[PDB]
């Protein structure tokens, strides 16, 4: 299970870099689209997930895109900079000045904080790989998926997989700590989507530009989300 996840990790992606809000947001949107490809490529080979109906795989991916991009961001941020900065790309690294010019300073701070958690925890690559899959399996539609049961067994197997990876008392505490971090991610992710949705909606007036693959994902996602019909699963 776990050895496979270690092999399948994604490739380096460049953002392709005046530091105006419009420019940074547009660059972030552009980075997210390229990353989206890596996400699809990664998800495709995931054990269990690949046997799921295709429509189901896509639905899961669209729902969890922001969350996946974020978790991956903390991890790059953790490894490359000891969580000092937000390491979006080798060519796009934020500091407090960048967060400010970005116009997303507080959201960025929350993200950095999640990142700091990785250091406090000393998150292993083994823990990180599992949690990522779990994030991909965290938000479902209200009426569910085409094969809800199938999704359910695999989500459960994966939770069990994470518990294996984490004395008994300490292990249980770690499992609590990681599951809690996943919940906290969702709170932050929800805020990012709200902001992303608004800029998307107010795109022409704002001058913030989104890539085509992303435009497709967002247009579809926004009604079901703001409507409260995306069922995000919470551990605690
Ligand atoms: O116009 C907007 C406003 O809302 C957003 C909100 C969020 C993002 C994308 C982020 C972003 C920005 C701040 C904190 C976490 C994240 C999620 O991690 C990412 C990882 C990437 F590889 C590339 C872009 C992002 C983009 C937009 N676009």
Curated annotation (Swiss-Prot):
Phenotype for residue 44 to E: Loss of coactivator binding
Effect noted on mutating residue 55 to R: Decreased coactivator binding
Binding site for 21-hydroxyprogesterone: 29, 35, 76, 199
Mutagenesis / variant outcome for changing residue 29 to A/D/H/Q/S/T: Abolishes aldosterone binding and transcription transactivation
Phenotype for residue 41 to E: Decreased coactivator binding
Effect of residue 206 to A: Reduces transcription transactivation
Stated consequence of mutating residue 196 to S: Abolishes steroid binding and transcription transactivation
Phenotype for residue 226 to G: In PHA1A; reduces affinity for aldosterone and transcription transactivation
Binding-site list for progesterone: 29, 35, 76, 199
Effect of residue 26 to N: Loss of transcription transactivation
Effect of substituting residue 233 to P: In PHA1A; loss of aldosterone binding and transcription transactivation
Tissue distribution of the protein: Ubiquitous. Highly expressed in distal tubules, convoluted tubules and cortical collecting duct in kidney, and in sweat glands. Detected at lower levels in cardiomyocytes, in epidermis and in colon enterocytes.
Modifications after synthesis and translation: Phosphorylated.
Residue positions binding aldosterone: 29, 35, 76, 199
Subcellular location: Cytoplasm; Nucleus; Endoplasmic reticulum membrane
Stated consequence of mutating residue 69 to L: In EOHSEP; alters receptor specificity and leads to constitutive activation
Subunit structure: Heteromultimeric cytoplasmic complex with HSP90, HSP70, and FKBP4, in the absence of ligand. After ligand binding, it translocates to the nucleus and binds to DNA as a homodimer and as a heterodimer with NR3C1. May interact with HSD11B2 in the absence of ligand. Binds the coactivators NCOA1, NCOA2, TIF1 and NRIP1.
Connected disease: Pseudohypoaldosteronism 1, autosomal dominant: A salt wasting disease resulting from target organ unresponsiveness to mineralocorticoids. PHA1A is a mild form characterized by target organ defects confined to kidney. Patients may present with neonatal renal salt wasting with hyperkalaemic acidosis despite high aldosterone levels. These patients improve with age and usually become asymptomatic without treatment.
Protein name stated in the entry: Mineralocorticoid receptor
């Amino acid at each position: 299970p776990v050895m496979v996840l270690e092999n399948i990790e994604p490739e380096i992606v460049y953002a392709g870099y005046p530091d105006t809000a419009e420019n940074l947001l547009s660059t972030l949107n552009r980075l997210a689209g390229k990353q989206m490809i890596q996400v699809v490529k990664w998800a495709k080979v995931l054990p269990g997930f690949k046997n799921l109906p295709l429509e189901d795989q896509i639905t899961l991916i669209q729902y969890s895109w922001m969350s996946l991009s974020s978790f991956a961001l903390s991890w790059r941020s953790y490894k490359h900079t000891n969580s000092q900065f937000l390491y979006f790309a080798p060519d796009l690294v934020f500091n407090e000045e960048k967060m400010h010019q970005s116009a997303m300073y507080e959201l960025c701070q929350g993200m950095h904080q999640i990142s700091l958690q990785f250091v406090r925890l000393q998150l292993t690559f083994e823990e990180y790989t599992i949690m990522k899959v779990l994030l991909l399996l965290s938000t479902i539609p209200k009426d569910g998926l085409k094969s809800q049961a199938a999704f359910e067994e695999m989500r459960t197997n994966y939770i069990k997989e994470l518990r294996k990876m984490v004395n008994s008392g300490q292990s249980w505490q770690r499992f609590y700590q990681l599951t809690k971090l996943l919940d906290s991610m969702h709170d932050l992710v929800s805020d990012l989507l709200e902001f992303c949705f608004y800029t998307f909606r107010e795109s022409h007036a704002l001058k913030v530009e989104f890539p085509a693959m992303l435009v497709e994902i967002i247009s579809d996602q926004l009604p079901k989300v703001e409507s409260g019909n995306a069922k995000p699963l919470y551990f605690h």
